[PDB]
Amino acid sequence: AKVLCVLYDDPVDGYPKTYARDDLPKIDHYPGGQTLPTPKAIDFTPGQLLGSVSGELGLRKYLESNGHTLVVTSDKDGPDSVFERELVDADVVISQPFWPAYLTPERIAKAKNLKLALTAGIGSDHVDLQSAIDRNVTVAEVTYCNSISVAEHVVMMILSLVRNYLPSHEWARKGGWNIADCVSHAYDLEAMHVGTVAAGRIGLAVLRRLAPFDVHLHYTDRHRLPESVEKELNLTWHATREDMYPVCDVVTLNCPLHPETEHMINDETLKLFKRGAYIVNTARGKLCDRDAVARALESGRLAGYAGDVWFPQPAPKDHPWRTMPYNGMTPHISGTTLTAQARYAAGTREILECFFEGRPIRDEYLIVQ
Amino acid sequence: AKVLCVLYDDPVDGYPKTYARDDLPKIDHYPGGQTLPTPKAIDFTPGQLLGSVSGELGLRKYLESNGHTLVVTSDKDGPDSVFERELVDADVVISQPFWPAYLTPERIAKAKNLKLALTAGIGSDHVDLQSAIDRNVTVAEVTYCNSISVAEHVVMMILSLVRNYLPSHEWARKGGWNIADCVSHAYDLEAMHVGTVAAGRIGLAVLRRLAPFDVHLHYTDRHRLPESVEKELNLTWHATREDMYPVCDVVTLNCPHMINDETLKLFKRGAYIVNTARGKLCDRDAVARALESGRLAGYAGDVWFPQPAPKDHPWRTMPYNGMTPHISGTTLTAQARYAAGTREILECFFEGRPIRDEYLIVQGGALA
Numbered sequence: 014a015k016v017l018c019v020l021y022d023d024p025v026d027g028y029p030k031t032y033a034r035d036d037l038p039k040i041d042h043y044p045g046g047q048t049l050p051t052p053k054a055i056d057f058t059p060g061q062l063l064g065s066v067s068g069e070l071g072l073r074k075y076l077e078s079n080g081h082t083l084v085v086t087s088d089k090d091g092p093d094s095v096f097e098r099e100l101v102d103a104d105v106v107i108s109q110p111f112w113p114a115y116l117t118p119e120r121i122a123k124a125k126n127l128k129l130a131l132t133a134g135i136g137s138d139h140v141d142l143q144s145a146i147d148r149n150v151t152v153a154e155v156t157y158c159n160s161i162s163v164a165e166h167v168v169m170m171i172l173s174l175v176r177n178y179l180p181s182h183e184w185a186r187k188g189g190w191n192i193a194d195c196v197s198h199a200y201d202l203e204a205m206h207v208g209t210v211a212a213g214r215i216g217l218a219v220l221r222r223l224a225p226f227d228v229h230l231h232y233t234d235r236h237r238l239p240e241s242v243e244k245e246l247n248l249t250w251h252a253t254r255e256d257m258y259p260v261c262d263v264v265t266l267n268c269p270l271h272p273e274t275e276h277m278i279n280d281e282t283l284k285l286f287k288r289g290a291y292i293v294n295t296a297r298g299k300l301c302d303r304d305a306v307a308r309a310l311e312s313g314r315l316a317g318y319a320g321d322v323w324f325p326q327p328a329p330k331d332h333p334w335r336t337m338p339y340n341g342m343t344p345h346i347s348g349t350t351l352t353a354q355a356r357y358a359a360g361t362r363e364i365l366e367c368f369f370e371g372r373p374i375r376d377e378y379l380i381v382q
Numbered sequence: 383a384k385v386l387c388v389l390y391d392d393p394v395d396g397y398p399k400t401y402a403r404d405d406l407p408k409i410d411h412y413p414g415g416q417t418l419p420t421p422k423a424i425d426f427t428p429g430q431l432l433g434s435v436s437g438e439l440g441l442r443k444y445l446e447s448n449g450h451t452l453v454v455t456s457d458k459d460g461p462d463s464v465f466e467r468e469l470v471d472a473d474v475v476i477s478q479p480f481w482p483a484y485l486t487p488e489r490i491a492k493a494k495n496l497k498l499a500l501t502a503g504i505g506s507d508h509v510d511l512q513s514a515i516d517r518n519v520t521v522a523e524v525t526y527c528n529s530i531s532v533a534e535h536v537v538m539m540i541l542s543l544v545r546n547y548l549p550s551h552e553w554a555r556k557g558g559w560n561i562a563d564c565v566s567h568a569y570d571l572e573a574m575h576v577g578t579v580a581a582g583r584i585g586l587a588v589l590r591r592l593a594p595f596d597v598h599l600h601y602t603d604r605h606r607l608p609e610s611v612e613k614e615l616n617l618t619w620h621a622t623r624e625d626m627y628p629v630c631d632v633v634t635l636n637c638p639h640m641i642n643d644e645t646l647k648l649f650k651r652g653a654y655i656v657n658t659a660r661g662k663l664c665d666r667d668a669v670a671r672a673l674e675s676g677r678l679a680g681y682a683g684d685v686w687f688p689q690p691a692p693k694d695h696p697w698r699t700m701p702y703n704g705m706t707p708h709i710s711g712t713t714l715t716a717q718a719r720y721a722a723g724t725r726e727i728l729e730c731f732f733e734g735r736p737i738r739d740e741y742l743i744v745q746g747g748a749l750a
Contacts, residue, residue, distance in 0.1 A: 024563040033679040034652030038573030038598075038631070060569075065562040111561055162570045165595065169541035176538055176713060181706040182548060188693035190707045192480055193393040193434040197401075201531045201715040204407035225590040226534065262407075289403035316402040330557035343550040344559045350545065352570040 014104035014369070015082045015126070018133075019089045019096055019114035020066045028067040032060050037352050043157040044218065047377055050155065050359035053366055059355040064109055070133060070358045072107075072365075079369070089114040097123075105129040105368070107361060111349045113139035121148055129368055133361045134348055135159060137380045138270075145381055152381035153374055155360030157214060159348030163295050164218035166321065166347035167265055171223075173341045174291045174317030175202045175263070198316070198339070202226050208261035210254055212238055215295075216267045220246055233257050258285040263293065266320075270297035280305045289316035295347055298324035307337040315339070321347045383732065384451045384495070386472040388458045388465055389435050390481035397436035401429055406715055412526040413587065416740060419524060419723030428718035433478055439502060439721040441728070448732070458483045469493050474731070476500040476724060480712045482508035490517050498731050499744075502724045503528060503711055505638075506743045507660075514744045521744040522737050524723030526583055528711035532658050533587030535684060535710035536634050539656045540592075543680035543704050544571045544632070567679070567702065571595045574631035579623055581607050584658070585636040589615055602626045624648060635659045642668045646677060654680040658710050661687030666697065673701045684710040 037059045042048050057063060057071030064070070066087050076083040084103075089096035089112070096114050100106065104126050108114035116130050121144040130140050132154040145152050173179060177199035184191045207223055208231035209216040217238070220230050224246050231249040232238075233256070243250065251257035254277075258264060264286065268274045278292065278301035286292075292315060294301055303324060309315040319341030323332060326345055334342055360378070367374050374382075406428045411417055426432055426440030433439065438454045445452040457464035458477070465483050469475070473495045477483035485499055490513040499509050501523040514521050542548055546568035553560050576592050577600035578585040586607065589599055593615050602620040606612065612619065620626035627633060627648040635641070637659035646668055649655075655678060657664050666687060672678035682704030686695060689708060697705055723741065730737050742750040 021561045024566050025560060026563070029566050031676070033567055033676060034569075034631075034650075037569065038575075040573050040596075062562060062566050064565075161572050161596075165541060165571055166545060166547075169538065169545060169547055172534060172538035173542065173547065176535060178538055178542070178706065179548075179551060181709060182704065185691075185698050185705040185707055188698060190690045191394065192390045192707055192709050192712065193431060195707055195709045196433075196712050196714060196717075197393050197398050197431050199709065199713045200403070200406070201713050202534050203530045203715070204409050206407075221594040225593060227530075262403075287403075289401075313400065313402065327559045328554075335554050335557065340554075341551060342554040343547065344554055344561055344564055346550060346561050346564045346568070347545075349561060349565050350568045350570050351565060352572070354565075 015084070015102055016072070016076055016105040016107065017096065017099045017103040017114075018070060018072065018083060018085045019106075019108035019112060020064055020069065020085055020087055021109070021112035022087050023065045023067050028065070029062050032351075034060060036060060037355055043160070044214070047157055050158070050356055050363045052359050052363035055359055055362060057355070057358060060351050062351065063354040063358040064111065064133070064349050068354075070107065070361050072362065075362060087112060100124045100127075102126050105131060105365070107131040107133050108139065109134045109349065109357075110136055110139065111345055116140040116145065118144045121145060121150065129153065129364075131361060131364055133357045142381050150381070151368070151374070151379070153364050153378045154380055155357040155364070156377040158357040158360055159353035160214035161218055162350050162353040163215050163347045164222060166343075167215070167219050167293050167295055168222045170293050170319035170341050171207070171263055171265065171291065172202060174293070174319055174339070175200050175205070179341055202228060204228060205262035206231060206260055207263040207265070208232060208251070208257045209265045209267065210257070211267035213267060216265070217242075219265055220248065231257050231261055255282070255285055259287065261290065262287065263291040266292070266294040266296045266300055268296050268300050270299050275299050276302045278302060278305065280308065283309055283314060286315065288314060291315065291317045294318075294320035295322055298322045298326060303333065307333045310337045310339045317341060321345050383473040384453070384471055385441070385445055385474040385476065385728070386465065386468050387439060387441065387452060387454045388475075388477040388481060388483035389433055389437070389439070389454060389456060390478070391456050392434045392436050397434065398431055401714070403429060405429055406718055412529070413583070416526050419527070419719060419726045421722050421725040422729055424722055424725060426718070426721060429714055431714065432717045432721040433480060433502065433712050439476065439724050441725065444725065456481065466492070471495050474498045474500060474728070476502050477508065478502045478712065478720075479505065479507060480708055485509040485514070487513040490514060490519065498522065498727075500724060500727055502720050511744055511749070515747055515749070518747055519744065520731070520737070520742070522727045522741045523743055524720040524727070525740045527720040527723055528713070528716035529583030530587055531713050531716040532584045532710045533591060535706075536584070536588050536636070536656055536658055537591045539682035539704050540576065540632055540634065540654065541571060543654045543656070543682050543702065544569050544574070548704055571597060573597065575600060575629050576632040576634070577601060577620070577626045577630035578634045578636055579626070580636045580638060582636065582638050586611070588634055588636065589617065600626050600630055632656070635663055637663070639665060641665060643671065646672055649678065651677060652679040654678065657681070657683035658685060661685045661689050670696045670700045673703065680704065684708050
């Protein structure tokens with residue numbers, strides 16, 4: 014078969030010859046018992062750059078030795094791209110949410126031989142599921158491969174906002190000292206009120222990491238956690254988002270993007286937030302009105318905003334969240350640490366091993382079958 | 383009395399008109415039950431900038447309404463400084479480790495009225511204890527005031543270093559995207575081995591904050607933590623440092639040459655070090671080497687040598703550093719507490735009533 018695999022670009026300086034460390038830490042399962050990927054074998058060293066065009070998810074040797082073809086490109090946008098030209102006869106498509114090859118209806122019409130749409134990572138937002146269903150296209154993901162990655166990045170961003178880390182580090186890096194400058198916007202996190210919207214994999218991992226900071230933990234979700242978890246972490250349940258926000262020193266978001274949660278943080282709803290509240294969002298850019306948030310950081314309504322999701326994405330060069338005051342932004346990278354890649358590359362081979370073997374794909378991996 | 387209070391400069395845009403937030407969280411006690419400072423009153427609103435010259439630790443009205451004089455200065459280096467010149471007849475000296483007024487033996491000997499040498503913050507690193515003992519000067523610190531602050535700053539640094547946050551952020555700020563240039567040096571913290579050298583107020587606060595990141599926690603110290611603590615945090619004790627460094631992905635140094643080219647040989651290839659303890663603790667050039675060569679994957683801290691660090695201090699710009707100026711213990715939050723404890727010690731001292739034992743370093747003519 015033909016496998017089309019859309020990956021992001023290599024580093025500008027070129028593809029890493031060497032890495033910072035020899036291996037990654039061994040992990041057996043994810044919180045909640047789901048074991049890590051279990052491919053029969055892997056042809057990479059964990060810790061290699063696997064999600065860029067030259068890392069190829071460690072897939073080529075295994076694909077080819079077994080008589081399949083692998084075409085790897087980063088050129089995925091619109092009608093004339095390599096992605097689009099190669100799709101028409103592709104049996105498998107693989108891409109990452111960090112560089113998504115969209116499987117629009119129009120595109121799935123054309124993928125005459127498409128059998129598998131694989132997310133190397135989590136979700137299927139780039140894939141029209143109903144179209145996949147009508148064409149008998151199996152849609153899979155590497156469930157949980159990066160939920161912990163994203164919660165670490167969230168807690169890191171909360172701390173960094175609270176303690177005014179990024180400007181503080183600019184002062185060192187630029188030759189200054191300027192203690193009062195570093196700290197006239199700097200607080201401890203301790204005993205702050207932190208709320209989370211949704212406590213799925215990500216949210217729950219975030220509250221768990223927050224707990225020993227002796228913050229006061231709040232949350233809201235479609236459905237509540239087992240009361241025993243609520244007890245072991247001292248959660249305050251809030252029935253609505255808009256009930257939670259007023260009492261939170263820090264709000265972290267884990268919503269999916271739907272017309273309802275689109276621009277749900279705006280100049281209006283921002284009146285619900287405590288003055289000098291911090292927001293962290295690694296869910297979806299659009300959950301927060303772009304210009305409203307910059308506004309808010311300009312007038313002191315919010316004291317910091319951070320996240321790695323943006324609208325549009327890739328974010329334009331002049332995107333105002335890049336340079337707004339008191340921001341701790343990163344490009345959309347949090348679930349593509351080299352650690353997460355190693356997991357999702359193994360997951361990707363694992364799905365492919367099963368798929369190619371007429372063996373059934375893990376239930377947790379399937380989105381559509 | 384004359385009280386001589388040395389403090390850091392105001393921000394370059396001036397003393398703040400308004401602040402980010404309207405108040406600070408309530409904290410009940412410190413880990414282990416030590417209470418928060420207990421002055422009769424404060425004259426500041428917690429959250430104000432107190433540790434710069436215009437903040438005056440919020441001590442003016444109080445000192446002066448009691449018939450005392452308060453001289454507040456940032457000028458503390460040399461004999462022609464406002465500090466040394468006002469020192470000769472000061473009854474009380476206050477400074478912060480963030481802008482410390484050294485009480486060297488020659489200074490203490492010139493300090494003819496010196497009764498109380500007060501740290502607004504922790505320790506007495508800048509005070510010659512022998513001379514204070516010989517000269518019957520009491521030395522007090524506001525114990526615990528910023529241990530939690532430093533701990534946060536540590537775990538913040540550890541995450542940032544491990545996840546390559548700072549450069550990733552520099553890419554966003556600068557109009558870039560460059561996913562692979564962000565993550566080609568980024569990892570998750572989860573399941574790495576993290577070691578702390580010493581598990582006192584900071585070390586243990588750190589360990590507790592790392593626990594739910596599912597790291598493997600190591601520590602060494604003069605003594606073991608209680609077994610109940612070791613067990614709740616699945617700590618692995620190490621009897622020597624030498625024994626702990628080899629197994630650790632991240633080493634955080636928390637004190638209560640000697641990390642050099644030789645001792646770095648014990649560190650795992652790609653280890654991270656975070657040092658909020660003392661500048662000189664990690665050899666400037668060993669560290670810079672180790673990062674240039676990749677023997678270490680990161681270094682961060684808030685303490686430097688020399689300190690203040692000279693504009694060209696290589697730790698500022700070396701690869702994979704996550705440095706800040708010396709600030710971890712002087713968040714607005716930490717300041718409220720130590721201004722408070724500074725006032726408390728003062729009230730007690732002035733009325734001839736005894737200072738908390740826990741605040742005391744030197745009293746009478748001995749270590750207390």
